[PDB]
């Protein structure tokens, strides 16, 4: 089961070249497996950018998963937002481990983090933004709450 849980990691990569999803691969070797699947439509090509959501599912069944690990420092094109914090804030070690989760390589691994209520999840997100240091937006389906996270 662990042996069959071996993926083509680092082998499919979507890059957003200024709101343009270019689905690169690390090699032409991935392309010969990928062309066997025909739902779609080093080497990138045209994909309907809404259909990326469904073909991520489709490549999960055909077991070549894409990774999202942002080289923000190598993406000089997007303007950086160099914003720091105060030394008076104290990061708890589980929040430090959570920051180590997407920064095993330093590239921004995209994913899910769920924490208990009142755990300073706002402060963890503020720390994550202050170490990402790029253009960034915050979303939540309410108003009173959204203005108090702004505060």
């Amino acid at each position: 089961f662990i042996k069959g849980a071996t993926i083509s990691y680092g082998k499919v990569k979507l890059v957003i070249k200024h709101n343009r999803y270019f689905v690169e691969t690390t090699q032409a070797d991935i392309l010969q497996m990928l062309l066997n699947d025909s739902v779609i439509g080093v080497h990138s090509f045209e994909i309907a950018n809404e259909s990326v959501e469904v073909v991520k599912k489709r490549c999960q069944e055909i077991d070549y998963p894409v990774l999202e690990e942002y080289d923000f420092r190598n993406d000089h094109r997007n303007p950086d937002l160099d914003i720091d914090l105060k030394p008076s804030t104290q990061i708890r070690p589980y929040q430090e481990k959570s920051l180590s989760k997407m920064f095993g390589n330093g590239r921004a691994r995209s994913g899910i983090i769920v924490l208990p209520c009142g755990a300073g999840k706002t402060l963890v997100g503020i720390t994550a933004a202050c170490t990402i240091k790029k253009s960034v937006i915050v979303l939540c389906t309410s108003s009173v709450s959204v203005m108090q996270w702004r505060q």
Partner: protein, 111 residues
């Protein structure tokens, strides 16, 4: 110290914590016929040196003449002061590079 050198041949120089030795024949135009250093062959260690680069809050600490009036690092410094004040049996001394800065920090500390 030149007329001391040409007045006396047996000029013998020693100190406690003079380390290293080589810049002293640079700053003073002289040489020694021999020079070395000595460390004690103590049984077990009874002086305990360690370098603290951070408080218990893990905040980097310094006493530079620009960032000397940084109240967060000041609060860290007094957390250290509290924790040694709670545990000091007999005597304890703190030094700083500059007496005006001492008076400034102790003034706001008393405040």
């Amino acid at each position: 110290i030149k007329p001391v050198f040409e007045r006396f041949s047996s000029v013998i120089i020693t100190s406690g914590t003079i380390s290293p030795l080589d810049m002293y024949p640079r700053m003073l135009n002289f040489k020694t016929v021999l020079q070395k250093s000595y460390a004690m062959t103590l049984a077990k260690k009874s002086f305990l040196p360690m370098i603290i680069t951070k408080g218990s809050d893990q905040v980097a600490i310094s006493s530079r003449f620009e960032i000397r009036n940084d109240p967060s690092i000041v609060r860290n410094y007094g957390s250290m002061l509290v924790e040694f004040a709670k545990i000091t049996p007999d005597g304890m001394v703190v030094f700083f590079p500059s007496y005006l800065y001492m008076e400034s920090i102790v003034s706001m500390w008393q405040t």
